[PDB]
Design a protein around this ligand. Structure first.
Ligand SMILES: [Mg+2]
Ligand SMILES: [Mg+2]
Ligand SMILES: [Mg+2]
Ligand SMILES: [Mg+2]
Ligand SMILES: [Zn+2]
Lengths: 38, 136, 141, 94
RNA sequence: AGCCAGGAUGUUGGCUUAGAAGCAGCCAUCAUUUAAAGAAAGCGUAAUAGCUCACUGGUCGAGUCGGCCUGCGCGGAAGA
């Protein structure tokens, strides 16, 4: 996954979710979109 | 890269940048990008942002730049004592107060003026906001 | 009309049957023959004319060859011989390039006894008007 | 058709007018005609939303101060330097 | 919001196409049957494509969408 200050939906399948205290991007169509920490 | 073509004097006192801005209304185009904070825009900065916005609208619409450098900044290089005369002018900046309309644009759909203004702001050292023209 | 079961479309003209250069190995590989594009192909190709592009069904199941009743030619195929250039585009939207009028192709597509949409034949009339405009011509309608 | 409610101002000056905007009200003024001008306080959101509409600046609007009705036209407006807000309006008795 | 349907016809679109059939290309962006369906949404075939979408029927049955002024927080945050 890509970890960095600004995380962002990259596509219609990207979702945003808070797990523990952390903003995370789950995408259901594209592993390269999975992000952490922003 | 904007800068005076000529000037009465080479160097300026540092001065302070108090006060609120003077050109505060979108007064040429249909949309403006406005200074919300206080700071200095440099020529390179003014130009980087310009480039950003100009390419966003491809060859379309029109653009005014409401701000112009005109303030010469000096610096002393590495390995130099304090004193021994004021340093060399390295660049120019424009003093910015909250309220300044910086760029204005026209001849494009709002959303595009927004996209373009966004992109340009990312190059700027001070917070900005999208403004529209008003009656009165 | 039912669902999926064999059908393609990749040829050059009714006057070049079964060919190899434009197509070749990709004209018979699944219950279809590079040698049998004439016995049902020419089941009415020669009779009428050899000078109009037309693709056609395949309908296969597992029966030796294939059963494919043919039908009509396109409408940009009838702008090379009946309404202008054999090229087409040129510089499509740079200047008007070439031109057509309403008398032209009205009958050269009012033929269609095996295709077209809309009972009104003043309409599926104008349906073939654009196939002379995806190339960017002029309207003498 | 545009109807703006408005008390007259018991105070004046920087201090009073800043206090004003701190309470989401904002000062304005009416002049023109032969009467003395009238120093007014307007609600912010109400007037603000209203002047989003172009006709606000063309039409005669009516200002209700103390049940009395004054008919005016927008004359000049001072806007906030970078916030979508209103600092002061000039109304002409017309 | 979800689930069931459809997603068509000039047109496999003419095209500096070897092959494109919506696809880096090509240029414009029209026009038929319809409830609506884009010469265009897509991962993407040797070319057919097979498969979900933009849009519209049905089902359901009461709320739903996201900008504005704002209070307080969250990430951004590595050292002997
Ligand atoms: Mg854990
Ligand atoms: Mg004081
Ligand atoms: Mg629904
Ligand atoms: Mg923080
Ligand atoms: Zn994604």
């Amino acid at each position: 996954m890509k970890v960095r200050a600004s995380v962002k939906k990259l596509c219609r399948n990207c979702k945003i979710v808070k797990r523990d205290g952390v903003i995370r991007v789950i995408c259901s169509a594209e592993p390269k979109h999975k992000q952490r920490q922003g | 890269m904007l800068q005076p073509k000529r000037t009465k004097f080479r160097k300026m006192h540092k001065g302070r940048n108090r006060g609120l801005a003077q050109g505060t209304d979108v007064s040429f185009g249909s949309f403006g990008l406005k200074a919300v904070g206080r700071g200095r825009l440099t020529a390179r900065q003014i130009e980087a942002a310009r480039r950003a916005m100009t390419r966003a609208v491809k060859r379309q619409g029109k653009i005014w730049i409401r701000v112009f450098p005109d303030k010469p900044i000096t610096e002393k290089p590495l390995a130099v004592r304090m004193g021994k005369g004021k340093g060399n002018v390295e660049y120019w900046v424009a003093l910015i107060q909250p309220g300044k309309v910086l760029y204005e644009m026209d001849g494009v759909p709002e959303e595009l003026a927004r996209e373009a203004f966004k992109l340009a702001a990312a190059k700027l050292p001070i917070k900005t906001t999208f403004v529209t023209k008003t009656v009165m | 009309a039912k669902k999926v079961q064999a059908y393609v479309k990749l040829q050059v003209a009714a006057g070049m049957a079964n060919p190899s250069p434009p197509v070749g190995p990709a004209l018979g590989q699944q219950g279809v023959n590079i040698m049998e594009f004439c016995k049902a192909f020419n089941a009415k190709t020669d009779s009428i004319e050899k000078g109009l592009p037309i693709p056609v069904v395949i309908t296969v199941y597992a029966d030796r060859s294939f059963t494919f009743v043919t039908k009509t030619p396109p409408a940009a195929v009838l702008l090379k011989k009946a309404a202008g250039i054999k090229s087409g585009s040129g510089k499509p939207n740079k200047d008007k390039v070439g031109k057509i009028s309403r008398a032209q192709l009205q009958e050269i597509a009012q033929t269609k006894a095996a295709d077209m949409t809309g009972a009104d034949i003043e309409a599926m009339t104008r349906s073939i008007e654009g196939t002379a405009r995806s190339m960017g011509l002029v309207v003498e309608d | 058709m545009f109807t703006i409610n408005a008390e007259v101002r018991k105070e004046q000056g920087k201090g009073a007018s800043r206090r004003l905007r701190a309470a989401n009200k904002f000062p304005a003024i009416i002049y023109g005609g032969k009467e003395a001008p009238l120093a007014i306080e307007l609600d912010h959101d109400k007037v603000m939303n209203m002047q989003a509409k172009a006709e606000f600046y063309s039409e005669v609007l009516t200002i209700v101060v103390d049940g009395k009705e004054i008919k005016v036209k927008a004359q000049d407006v001072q806007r906030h330097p970078y916030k979508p807000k209103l600092q002061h309006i000039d109304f002409v008795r017309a």
